[PDB]
Amino acid sequence: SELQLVEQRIRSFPDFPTPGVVFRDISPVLKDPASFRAAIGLLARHLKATHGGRIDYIAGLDSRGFLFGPSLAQELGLGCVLIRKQGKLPGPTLWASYSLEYGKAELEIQKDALEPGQRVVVVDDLLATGGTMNAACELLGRLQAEVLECVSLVELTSLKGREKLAPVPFFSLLQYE
Amino acid sequence: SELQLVEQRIRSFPDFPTPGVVFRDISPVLKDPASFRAAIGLLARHLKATHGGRIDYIAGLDSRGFLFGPSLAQELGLGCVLIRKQGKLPGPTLWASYSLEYGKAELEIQKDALEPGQRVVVVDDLLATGGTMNAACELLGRLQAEVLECVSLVELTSLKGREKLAPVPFFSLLQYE
Ligand SMILES: Nc1ncnc2c1ncn2[C@@H]1O[C@H](COP(=O)(O)O)[C@@H](O)[C@H]1O
Ligand SMILES: Nc1ncnc2c1ncn2[C@@H]1O[C@H](COP(=O)(O)O)[C@@H](O)[C@H]1O
């Protein structure tokens, strides 16, 4: 199956970047053409079956979300907008600087990236605490854009990222502790 | 034409990130589905006509190169390997830390990213001084990989990035001063 091709392309690294943390690496997905295609296809088919043609843009998150954003957008015949780490984008920007318990979620977006009312789906490689995607949703909301859903390849369920994103819908391909 | 669709989707910002520097933003290319597709198509057709089927992988550069790497690889039916900013990748890595006159080129790659003899094409959004791509080429060389060519959407010719990359071939879609 398609999901199998993604399932077998996740590599785990203990104690990275800090002790006690298991890093989930999506590199083998990118390196395997069939796996990357399967991952994009699964995400696209979910979004199309869920939102139909009401999605205006895909928003990819700096930096690993950039790996999936464009391809997912292209599959849906949509454009891709950028949400970057702070200090990276030119022109007027909105900032979202969050200080959570175990890290910082600090993003930015150009003020002219979206028009009010436009509907967007956010994509990153992995959802953990949800601090990053929540910060992205805040930026989009302040542009008066509508966030239809957030999606990722990997979800760490024990970190309760889904509850944090609520009521914004979320979907992941693979779930780990 | 296809090139026209890319030509009309580059935005310039004066004095970013520092005074005297004109920032070339490829964001409109990503936001326009036809433009992004045209850009990928032009790069792919060049690489296929130049290297045939001798390319094993595409290497995308953190972070804006991640926007084009996967799609370019998929178009050529190839996998995409990652070259990241330092401290981002898990496992054993090689580092390339360069201090040029007007900036730093500091990248890293996993030691198991490539096998000796494998042939790779490097992609980023823009070539300036060439310090970044040269650092990438160094990393690949130390893995005993062969760099067939480096490609980008935009090239700033007055900064002489091409001469720096020599004898490694280079190709860009758009050239500015
Ligand atoms: N255990 C992990 N393995 C790989 N990436 C992670 C991990 N935990 C958090 N991240 C990254 O952190 C960002 C989101 O985390 P969070 O804000 O906690 O949901 C994304 O860039 C994720 O890829
Ligand atoms: N004028 C510019 N506009 C947009 N990106 C730039 C510019 N100059 C350098 N860069 C970025 O710097 C990196 C390569 O620069 P360089 O190492 O000097 O060839 C890439 O990430 C480029 O996108």
Curated annotation (Swiss-Prot), chains A, B:
Q: Which residues form the signal peptide?
A: none
Taxonomic superkingdom? Eukaryota
Q: Which GO terms describe its biological process?
A: adenine salvage; AMP salvage; GMP salvage; grooming behavior; IMP salvage; purine ribonucleoside salvage
Chain positions with Phosphothreonine modification: T132
Tell me what happens on changing M133T: In APRTD; Japanese type; allele APRT*J; most common mutation
The metabolic or biological pathway listed in the UniProt record of this protein is: Purine metabolism; AMP biosynthesis via salvage pathway; AMP from adenine: step 1/1
Q: Which Gene3D superfamilies match?
A: 3.40.50.2020
PROSITE patterns associated with the record: PUR_PYR_PR_TRANSFER
Gene Ontology terms for molecular function: adenine binding; adenine phosphoribosyltransferase activity; AMP binding
* Function, in words: Catalyzes a salvage reaction resulting in the formation of AMP, that is energically less costly than de novo synthesis.
Clinical condition linked: Adenine phosphoribosyltransferase deficiency: An enzymatic deficiency that can lead to urolithiasis and renal failure. Patients have 2,8-dihydroxyadenine (DHA) urinary stones.
Q: What is this protein called?
A: Adenine phosphoribosyltransferase
Taxonomic lineage of the native organism: Eukaryota, Metazoa, Chordata, Craniata, Vertebrata
